[PDB]
Amino acid sequence: MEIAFLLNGETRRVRIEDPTQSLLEWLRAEGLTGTKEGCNEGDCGACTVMIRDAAGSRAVNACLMMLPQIAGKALRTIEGIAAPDGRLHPVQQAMIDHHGSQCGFCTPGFIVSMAAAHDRDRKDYDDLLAGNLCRCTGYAPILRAAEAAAGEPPADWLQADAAFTLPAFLPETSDALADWYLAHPEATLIAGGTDVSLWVTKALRDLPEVAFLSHCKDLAQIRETPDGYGIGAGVTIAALRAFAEGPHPALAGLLRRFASEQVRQVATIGGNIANGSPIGDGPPALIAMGASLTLRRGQERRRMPLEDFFLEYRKQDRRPGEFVESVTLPKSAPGLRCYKLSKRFDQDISAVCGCLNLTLKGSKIETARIAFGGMAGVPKRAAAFEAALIGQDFREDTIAAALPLLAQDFTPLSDMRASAAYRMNAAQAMALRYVRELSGEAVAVLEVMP
Amino acid sequence: SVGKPLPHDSARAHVTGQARYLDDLPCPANTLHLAFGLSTEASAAITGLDLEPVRESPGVIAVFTAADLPHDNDASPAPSPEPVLATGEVHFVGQPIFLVAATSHRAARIAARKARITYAPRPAILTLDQALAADSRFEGGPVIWARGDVETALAGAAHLAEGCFEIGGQEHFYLEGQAALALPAEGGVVIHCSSQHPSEIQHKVAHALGLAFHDVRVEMRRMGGGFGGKESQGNHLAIACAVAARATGRPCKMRYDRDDDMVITGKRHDFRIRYRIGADASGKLLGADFVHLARCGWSADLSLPVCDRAMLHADGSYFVPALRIESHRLRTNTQSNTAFRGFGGPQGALGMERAIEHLARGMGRDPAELRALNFYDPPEKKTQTTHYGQEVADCVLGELVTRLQKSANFTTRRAEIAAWNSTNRTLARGIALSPVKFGISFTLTHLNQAGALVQIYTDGSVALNHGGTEMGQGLHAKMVQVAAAVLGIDPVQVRITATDTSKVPNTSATAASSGADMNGMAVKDACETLRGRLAGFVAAREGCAARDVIFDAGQVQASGKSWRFAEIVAAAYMARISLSATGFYATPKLSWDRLRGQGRPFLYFAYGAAITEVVIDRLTGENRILRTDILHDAGASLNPALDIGQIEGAYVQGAGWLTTEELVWDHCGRLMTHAPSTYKIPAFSDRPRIFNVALWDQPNREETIFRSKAVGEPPFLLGISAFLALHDACAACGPHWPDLQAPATPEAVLAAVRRAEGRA
Ligand SMILES: Cc1cc2nc3c(=O)[nH]c(=O)nc-3n(C[C@H](O)[C@H](O)[C@H](O)COP(=O)(O)OP(=O)(O)OC[C@H]3O[C@@H](n4cnc5c(N)ncnc54)[C@H](O)[C@@H]3O)c2cc1C
Ligand SMILES: Nc1nc2c(c(=O)[nH]1)N[C@H]1C(S)=C(S)[C@@H](COP(=O)(O)O)O[C@H]1N2
Ligand SMILES: O=c1[nH]c(=O)c2nc[nH]c2[nH]1
Ligand code: MOM
Ligand code: FES
Ligand code: FES
Ligand SMILES: [Ca+2]
């Protein structure tokens, strides 16, 4: 099988034979030595590369991405960031001017992230560069660099790549996929690859039967439905954050702290949900907002509520040949709030994910959707706490009284991320939070002004 | 060019991705790749080692065992053996047992995992108590130093704070992982590696191989970070490559994959510190009694000196008329802890800073004032000494802190915070000021030497080479600036060459923030030799005194005539004047007794202060630094840009150590925090939202290179400022002593808040 793509302004035809080779392995085997390896686990950004296509351009991790995924795309690496004639990008000159580097090892990845950001006139640096670890500089010098360079006009040589186009199954239609998965129920479905590629890099597994989903436009659509909003499985977390920014700010507030921008760009809801992981911050929020989920098995179209999908740790209501086709969200909350608790705010995982959503008939607590991640081998609603909260007054003590019930709802784990005591404690802490937030109180460190 | 804010020697190379690291260097297609097979017990004998499935994994060319080691099996930077390959038994989870050479790095890792090992497990020392309990310790007994008589002092103390608390470890997380490459070269070998100590690499690889030192060459251009992590942990890789090259006949590379890196390599010694501290009713300290329990891991490594430096730094910034330290360096079946920026310094320092915070709180005094009351006296009868008895004659701390306090708007802000807290019940702000006094020089004295070699070519260009290794600290540029400044020419004329044991020999590691100090002197020494030659030549040609020949701004001037530096050099070339010079430096005035705890181990101290402001979520423990204000003494800084850089970088790493950074083992000794997803260094938006750094600019009293001061490590201890501020936020949630532990994770902040509120 043979793909084609733009590589640093120049069309390159690779002839695929191992479909699972990271973009990282491949670039450095080519001698494109400037893309560095820092962890091979999505965390550090040292391998940050720039990809473009009809959607535009974004910085992603070369180590998570596997070759087939860049077919028909335009790809820029560090060695291609500067102009053909030799001129430095405003981003590169800035970084020198402002001493944005010291040992250098993380400098290619920032530059790529900074260029791609410059290319899309994005200025939200804290978020754009959260996936870029630097152990040397304290990041300050890098923030100046970014600001410094933002005055400058975008690189046209970079923009030029837009012109472009304009073994392992690669379907383009949902149908095409259904039929195939129907015959090969035992195959591995790669969406964004952000969970899957760690089985190859870290777990050292070989994936025999492989099908890629990121080249299948109809599966990755946000459509409006009579009953709300239909989000397709292939929609990226970045996109889903973008869409929620209007209708569902609270979800967009939570998705902000989902991995980095470089994972968000390629990681999907379908994947997050098909992974089926107790610490996955997608389900908690979506269950709290009472979204439905859709499955498909060729022509099949089962349609349960999300929470019911997750039966036990490592086990979901998923048939052979059946793939997460989409989820549907209601037209609106706004009684939803989401709480991610981690050791460090940006790119970390949740000890506890508290997602709460109550409706109030004037004063009496009417509806109780309280959902959690990280408290149990499955994401689940706080049943007995939910029960013990209906009919009641919406006030501190109301909930102050109900709290213990969670200890019946869950029996949390202890591990490096947090002690069970604390995981419990913080789970209850979120309820006292919810009331306080919902009554005009100062509640969030992140919103505090220096 | 000294004094100018000139950029890093490789700034452009970095920014373009053309700066090569070890895994980037070209090399022959026949190069093999190396992975270790690691122990899965913490304390076992090996009874069965079947490696057949390893030899048979695809691409695998050789499999190696301790029995297969030609000569030495020792990577320890210390006089006690530490095998590179397990010798009949294992001592922590992650210990290399065998070595695989295969035709690719994947293949190698893959096969490393295929061993059938049988163990006969044994009881394992994992907690510091089990260590005291079992007597699992290094040195045979604790190290004990006393100045005066604490017990007496404390007995009569108007005020006393007794306490105990934990300081956790720290993993380097240098962005460039450990790595090496060995090239068989008829009779001998050439090693390229990511190391801070090429000469030790040479030593080790030589012994591994049976070669005299003159057959082993170590070249090293730059590391993508080291922070002490590469002060010795590069040894196992280099030995592995060398031994495997000798056997296979072909070049051999080995880079640790990140997980391997955290499982294998040592980290920063975690401490339990127990303290008793006393003051009279004026607030002057009477005495301080410390006991240090340090986790050294399974082998000595550099634990002995690390712990020595904690003791040395137990005075914090303060004069103390009676002080005692009892230092237990306890052996455990875990990662052999090693150097990390600060080298025991920040641990001892924090122990004391916690004690003085306690005392202050306990007599309900403003902590800042109490510290300020106990700084060593300003420079100017007999000078105050340290507990080890070194005179402190450079202490500018009193004034620096004053200057920092006004420019940070300290008083006002504190009131602003109180008011804010009073109106809040979910969130809360704390603020702390903490000083720094860091002693400069290897406490192992004979390590305080540095060499340089300089060549001038006939086109007037200069090739510069020294023993220092570049790991991001901007050493090379400073070395360039010195040489440019001495020859009286533009930096651009001076090229830096890779560090190379065959160019400058017998070098110390680049550590103890001594690199620029001593290599700076070494470079200037060769440079002056070279200048002396040109002056003496010109003087004799132009009739006059050599001291009257001027080298400046790339021009030379003698007898009212002036030339370009080049024209002069071509002239001395033709006149047959050697345009090559070695240079060497040994730090003066150093003498001390390690055992008796008395002497002058340091040339001078590096000072500073920081004021961190933070906020905490009283429900969850979540938190942010909002503002930081640093004033730090770089001496007459050799490069103010590069210096601000080190300080900003050092602070963030220090603060990181006392906050989100946490090492965690399971009950079988397995490291659970062994990747970036589980071990959490400051992410971007962790930078202090307002970051103000300013250099105390005042020349050094002692004759260091252009009266500068090492800035390598000192600014790391400014991170205490953050931990102290965090505890200040807690102490505003209740009347109780919060007793915050380090690292101050959200969990640990929540716990300390709850104590202060006084609930379970
Ligand atoms: C650095 C880093 C940070 C991360 N941070 C977070 C985080 O903050 N929160 C969080 O929840 N997760 C996080 N993750 C992991 C997370 O699960 C993924 O990043 C993402 O949510 C999954 O998207 P994906 O398309 O890459 O899934 P993939 O990796 O493509 O898929 C994972 C599994 O789902 C299957 N699958 C995918 N799509 C479908 C489908 N449509 N139908 C049926 N099966 C399917 C795949 O075959 C595989 O079995 C992080 C990962 C990394 C590397
Ligand atoms: N960028 C960067 N700066 C760094 C380090 C590093 O690995 N990377 N290591 C430090 C350590 S551990 C020491 S000892 C020093 C000292 O280097 P010098 O002796 O050349 O000052 O600076 C520090 N600054
Ligand atoms: O022997 C040593 N003594 C020291 O003080 C030191 N600092 C870093 N590395 C060191 N080694
Ligand atoms: O002494 Mo610096 O190498 O930690
Ligand atoms: S290597 Fe760290 S993100 Fe790919
Ligand atoms: S400068 Fe060393 S990691 Fe960024
Ligand atoms: Ca290490």
The two counts, helices (H) then strands (E), for chain A are 17, 17
Are the C-beta atoms of B233 and B265 separated by less than 8 Å? yes
Q: Which is nearest to B517 in space by CA: B679, B654, B710, B334?
A: B710
Query: Is residue B128 in some structural domain?
Result: no
Domain around B177: 172-265
Phi, psi at A189, each rounded to 5°: -95, 115
Largest interatomic CA distance in chain A: 71
DSSP character string of B726-748: HHHHHTTS-SS-----SS--HHH
How close is the nearest chain A Cα to the Cα of B164, in Å?
A: 22
Distances (CA, A) of B595 to A12, B146, B162, B637: 67, 11, 27, 35
- Can you tell me the distance from the alpha carbon of B639 to that of B77, in angstroms, rounded to the nearest whole number? 32
Closest CB to A433 among B23, B619, B652: B619
List of residues 6+ apart from A148 with CB closer than 8 A: A90, A94, A97, A98
Q: Is the CB of residue B175 below 6 angstroms from any atom belonging to ligand 6? A: yes
Active site residue B713: yes
CATH class of A1-80: alpha beta
Asked if the C-beta of A425 comes within 8 angstroms of chain B's C-beta atoms, the answer is yes
Interface of B with A in 577-606 (CB under 8 A): none
B20–A33: do the CB atoms touch at under 8 Å?
yes
Assigned CATH for A81-166: 1.10.150.120
B652: closest CA among B640, B664, B644, B641?
B644
Interface of A with B in 340-359 (CB under 8 A): 341, 343-349
Residues B51 and B74 in one domain: yes
CB < 8 Å & 24+ apart, contacts of B407-410: B407/B629, B407/B631, B407/B694, B408/B611, B408/B629, B408/B692, B410/B368, B410/B611
What is the rounded distance in angstroms from the CA atom of residue A279 to the CA atom of residue A269?
14
Q: Which of B171, B513, B647 to mutate to test the pocket of ligand 2 (most atoms within 8 A of CB)?
A: B513
Please identify, among B575, B602, B629, the residue that sits at the C-terminal boundary of a domain.
B602
**Which helix (H) or strand (E) is B478 found in, with range?**
helix B475-487
Contact B367, B357 (CB under 8 A): yes
Pair of tokens at residue B493: 């004329």
For residues B221 and B20, the answer to whether their CB atoms sit within 8 Å is: yes
Helix residue ranges per DSSP H, B629-678: 640-657
Ligand nearest to the CA of B228: 4
Give the experimental resolution in Å: 2.6
Q: Count CB atoms within 10 A of the CB of residue B444.
A: 15
Burial class (CB in 10 A: 0-12, 13-18, 19+), A227: exposed
Ion ligand 7 residues within 5 Å by Cβ: B 172, 229, 265
Residue of A nearest to B341 (CA): A136
- Provide CATH 3.10.20.30 ranges for chain A: 1-80
User: Does the distance separating the beta carbons of A444 and B677 come in below 8 Å?
Assistant: no
Residue B337, domain CATH: 3.30.365.10
**Distance, CA of B170 to CA of A231 (rounded, Å):** 43
Out of B177, B648, B676, the one facing A141 most closely (by C-beta) is: B648
Among B7, B257, B691, beta carbon nearest to A140: B691
C-alpha distance from residue B290 to each of A431, B146, B352 (Å): 43, 10, 8
Identify which of B175, B259, B620 has the shortest CB distance to residue A105: B175
Cα–Cα nearest to B569, from B530, B596, B622, B595: B530
B750–chain A Cβ distance below 8 A for any pair: yes
- Residue where the block lists tokens 């090569």: B20
Q: CB distance B624–A101 less than 8 Å? A: no
What value, to the nearest 5°, has the Cα angle with vertex A89 and ends A83 and A92?
A: 130
Considering the domain A219-332 in this protein, what is its CATH number? 3.30.465.10
Q: How many domains does chain B have?
A: 5
Q: What is the DSSP letter of B346?
A: H
Provide, as residue numbers in chain B, all residues whose Cβ is less than 8 Å from the Cβ of A134.
Answer: 175
Give the position, in ligand 3's atom list, of the atom nearest the Cα of B509. Answer: 9
Q: Are strands A352-361 and A364-373 parallel, antiparallel or unpaired?
A: antiparallel
CA B736 to chain centre: 36
According to DSSP, the β-strands at B623-633 and B690-696 are parallel
Residue B61 domain flag = yes
Mutate to test the interface with A, among B620, B628, B678 (most CBs of A within 10 A): B620
Residues in chain A: 450
> Cα separation of A288 and B83, whole Å?
55
Sign for the pseudo-dihedral over CA of B590, B591, B594, B596: negative
Query: For B350, which DSSP code?
Result: H
Quote the radius of gyration of chain B (alpha carbons, Å).
27
Exactly one of B200, B713, B747, B757 is catalytic; name it: B713
Q: Which helix (H) or strand (E) holds B724?
A: helix B720-730
Within chain A, which residue ranges are assigned CATH 1.10.150.120? Answer: 81-166
What is the rounded CA–CA span in Å between residue B493 and residue B554? 9
Of A248, A78, A326, A347, whose CA–CA distance to B16 is shortest?
A78
B271 has which bridge partners?
A: B167, B294
Q: Tell me how far apart the alpha carbons of residues A191 and A324 are, in angstroms, rounded to a whole number.
A: 11
Residues 595-654 of B with CB under 8 A from A: 613, 615-617, 619-624, 626-627, 641-642, 645, 648-649, 651-653
Q: Which of B605, B621, B585, B582 is nearest to B713 (CA)?
A: B605
Q: How far apart are CA B468 and CA B479, in angstroms?
A: 9
Contact call for residues B642 and A99 (beta carbons, < 8 A): yes
**A210 annotated as ligand-binding:** no
With CA atoms as reference, the chain A residue closest to B689 would be A450
Best residue of B105, B475, B648, B684 to probe chain A, by most A CBs closer than 10 Å: B684
Residues across chain B: 760
At residue A300, the 3 state secondary structure works out as strand
Q: For A63, list phi and psi in degrees, rounded to 5.
A: -85, -25
Pairwise CB contact (< 8 Å): A130 & B619: no
Strands lying side by side in the sheet with B89-90: B89-90, B44-50, B116-121
Q: Give the separation between CA B497 and CA B501, rounded to whole angstroms.
A: 12
Residues of B in contact with A38 (CB under 8 A): 175-177, 258, 676
- Cα separation of B656 and B665, whole Å? 19
Paired tokens of B401: 């802190």
How do beta strands B216-220 and B188-193 pair?
parallel
Is residue B479 a part of any domain in this protein?
yes
The CATH number of the structural domain formed by A337-440 is 3.30.390.50
Inter-residue contact A117 to A146 (CB < 8 Å): yes
Which atom in ligand 2 lies closest to the alpha carbon of residue B223? 7
Cα–Cα distance measured from residue A102 to residue B644, given in angstroms and rounded to the nearest whole number: 12
B121: phi then psi, degrees, rounded to nearest 5:
-50, 160
User: Which residue is associated with the tokens 């975690």?
Assistant: B270
Pairing, β B499-500 against β B89-90:
unpaired
Q: Are residues B531 and B580 in the same domain?
A: yes
Atom 22 in ligand 2: residue holding the nearest Cα: B712
Q: Which two tokens stand for residue B410?
A: 């300290």
In angstroms, rounded to a whole number, what is the distance separating the alpha carbons of residues A327 and A324?
A: 8
- Which residues 94-113 on chain A approach chain B with CB closer than 8 angstroms? 95-96, 99-108, 111
Query: How many beta-carbon pairs under 8 angstroms link A with B?
Result: 241
- Kindly write down the DSSP assignment for every residue of B589-640, as one continuous string: S-EEETTTTEEE--S-EEEEEEEEEEEEETTT--EEEEEEEEEEE-BS-S-H
**The CA-based dihedral angle spanning residues A132, A257, A54, B15, taken in that order and rounded to the nearest 10 degrees:** -10
| Distance in angstroms (rounded) separating the CA atoms of residues A431 and A441 | 13
Quote the CA–CA distance of B691 and B688 in Å, as a whole number: 5
Chain B residues touching A81 at Cβ < 8 A = 16-17
Question: In angstroms, what CA-CA distances link A39 with A136, B43, B173, B229, B675?
Answer: 17, 29, 10, 17, 8
- Same domain, residue pair B587 and B496: yes
Give the separation between CA A119 and CA A95, rounded to whole angstroms: 16
Whether B90 and B3 share a structural domain: yes
What Cα–Cα distance (Å) separates residue B78 from each residue in B96, B296, B301, B303, B507? Answer: 19, 13, 6, 9, 16
| Rounded distance between C-alpha atoms, residue A1 and residue A16, angstroms | 5
Kindly give the residue spans of alpha helices, DSSP state H, lying in A189-342: 198-201, 237-244, 249-255, 261-264, 269-275, 282-288
Same domain for B85 and B1? yes
Residue pair B146/B320 in contact (Cβ under 8 Å)? The answer is no
What phi and psi, each to the nearest 5 degrees, are found at residue B384? -55, 140
Neighbours of A254 (CB within 10 A): 25
The first and second tokens of residue B195, run together, are 């190391």
Residue B212 class from Cβ within 10 Å (0-12 exposed, 13-18 middle, 19+ buried)?
A: exposed
Q: Rounded distance, CA B242 to CA B193, Å? A: 11
Question: Read out DSSP for B490-522?
Answer: -GGGEEE--EETTTS-SPPPS-TT-HHHHHHHH
Closest-CA residue to B678 (of B171, B107, B188): B171
DSSP annotation of A230 reads E
CA A255 to ligand 1 centroid distance, Å: 14
Q: Which of A18, A102, A430 to mutate to test the interface with B (most CBs of B within 10 A)?
A: A102
B130 occurs within a structural domain: no
How far is it, in rounded angstroms, from Cα A352 to Cα A379? Answer: 11
Closest of A412, A422, A358 to residue A390, by C-alpha: A358
Q: What is the DSSP string of B373-431?
A: TTBPPPP-----B-TT--B-----HHHHHHHHHHHTTHHHHHHHHHHHHHT-SSEEEEE
Cβ pair B176:A36 closer than 8 A: yes
Residues 351-410 of A with CB under 8 A from B: none
CA distances from B271 to A418, B3, B294, B599 (A): 21, 39, 5, 25
- Alpha carbon distance, N-terminus to C-terminus of chain A: 55
The reply to whether residue B11 touches residue A429, judged by beta carbons under 8 angstroms, is no
The answer to whether residue B430 neighbours chain A at the CB level (below 8 Å) is no
Looking at 1.10.287.3510, 3.30.43.10, 3.40.50.2300, 3.10.105.10, the CATH number of the domain A169-218 comes to 3.30.43.10
Question: Scanning the structure block, which residue is given the tokens 């059946």?
Answer: A322
Return the SS3 of B118: strand
Name residues whose C-beta falls within 8 Å of residue B247's C-beta, 6 or more positions apart in sequence. B62, B64, B68, B101
Looking at the structure, tell me whether residues B368 and B407 fall in a common domain.
Answer: no
Judge if B271 and B233 occupy the same domain: no
Are residue B274 and residue B166 in the same domain, yes or no? yes
**Sign of dihedral through CA atoms A233, A238, A241, A245?**
negative
Rounded to a whole number of angstroms, the distance from the CA of B221 to the nearest CA of chain A is 11
Domain shared by B483 and B521, yes or no: yes
* A311: number of Cβ within 10 Å: 12
CA distances from B607 to B58, B437, B547, B610 (A): 57, 5, 37, 11
Q: Where in chain A is the domain with CATH 3.30.43.10?
A: 169-218
Maximal C-alpha separation, chain B: 88
Determine, yes or no, domain membership for B129: no
Measured between CA atoms, the residue of chain A closest to residue B17 is A34
| Cβ distance of A41 and B675 shorter than 8 Å | yes
Closest by CA position to A394, among listed A427, A369, A426, A366: A366
**Residue A278 contacts by C-beta under 8 Å, 6 or more apart in sequence?**
A313, A373, A374, A375, A376, A377, A378, A379
Both B554 and B610 in one domain: the answer is: no
B686 touching chain A per CB within 8 A: yes
Q: Where in chain A is the domain with CATH 3.30.390.50?
A: 337-440
| Residue with tokens 């505003």, as numbered in its chain | B732
Strand bridging mode B44-50 / B116-121: antiparallel
Alpha-carbon span A139 to A145, nearest angstrom? 10
Identify whether residues B10 and B104 lie together within a single domain. yes
Alpha-carbon gap: B547 to the closest alpha carbon of chain A (Å): 38
Q: Are residues B145 and B291 in the same domain?
A: yes
- Structural element, H or E, at residue A140: helix A140-150
* Cα distance between the two ends of chain B: 61
Which chain A residues are within 8 Å of B427, Cβ to Cβ? 442-445, 448
- Whether B131 maps to a domain, the answer reads no
- Give the sign of the dihedral formed by CA A133, CA A134, CA A135, CA A138: negative
